[PDB]
């Protein structure tokens, strides 16, 4: 299924499966408090998770996995996925994080929550890196899908699911290289950019881990049953 797709088919499939950009319930007249900020971010993430779950089902190869494996991967990668999404839509807003079209925050506002500003700085740095590299939308969807399939693959006697995942991952790599070749990059440039993009995934993991660590220490505002169960997967 996923293995018979062409590069162009993979891209068009991933693009078509993109989730919408949701709005926060930010009232420009509060103005703020640790609790409110966290209320907004928590409220937003919860609604995003619902779209993320249905997006994952449209990622080629994902529904070929057992239900238990699908759960594992999403439990592992949910925050990384939210984060790369945030960084992606923040690309054209230097020094700012676009959580929603109506919620554009800077690092100083990130100080509203203890220990969150450190994460904001890393997210801003990541967005700056993407903007430098002039990351394309087709490349973005490839990276996000890689996170989904890769993050939990080493913490799952089937054994053949892990193998199925690796082949799909290889195809996404093929797709990435295909895009770069189309962009006119030389062979050396393709390999270099591919590495540059994948190395950023290590930083997205780092950000998720550090953020998750903080999130499940302060399980404050209502944490939607879905969110709690997602965090619980990492805690403690």
């Amino acid at each position: 299924l996923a293995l018979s797709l062409t590069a162009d088919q993979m891209v068009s499939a991933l693009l078509d499966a993109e989730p919408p950009i949701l709005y926060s319930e930010y009232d420009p007249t509060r103005p703020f408090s640790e609790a409110s900020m966290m209320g907004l971010l928590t409220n937003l993430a919860d609604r995003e998770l619902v779209h993320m779950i249905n997006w994952a089902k449209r990622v080629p190869g994902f529904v070929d996995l057992t239900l238990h494996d699908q759960v594992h991967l999403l439990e592992c990668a949910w925050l990384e996925i939210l984060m790369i999404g945030l960084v992606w839509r923040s690309m054209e807003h230097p020094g700012k994080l676009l959580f929603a079209p109506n919620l554009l925050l800077d690092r100083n506002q990130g100080k509203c929550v203890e220990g969150m500003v450190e994460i904001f700085d890393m997210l801003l740095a990541t967005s700056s890196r993407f903007r430098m590299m002039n990351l394309q939308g087709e490349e973005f969807v490839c990276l996000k899908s890689i996170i989904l399939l890769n993050s939990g693959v080493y913490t799952f006697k089937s054994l053949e699911e892990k193998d199925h995942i690796h082949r799909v991952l290889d195809k996404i790599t093929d797709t990435l290289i295909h895009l770069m070749a189309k962009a006119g990059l030389t062979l050396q440039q393709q390999h270099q950019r591919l590495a540059q993009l994948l190395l950023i995934l290590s930083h997205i993991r780092h950000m998720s881990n550090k953020g998750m660590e903080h999130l499940y220490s302060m399980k404050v505002v209502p944490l939607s049953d879905l969110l709690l169960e997602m965090l619980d997967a990492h805690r403690l």
Partner: peptide
């Protein structure tokens, strides 16, 4: 699990 359900729909 909820995630279990939503994936299952």
């Amino acid at each position: 699990k909820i995630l279990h359900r939503l994936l299952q729909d």
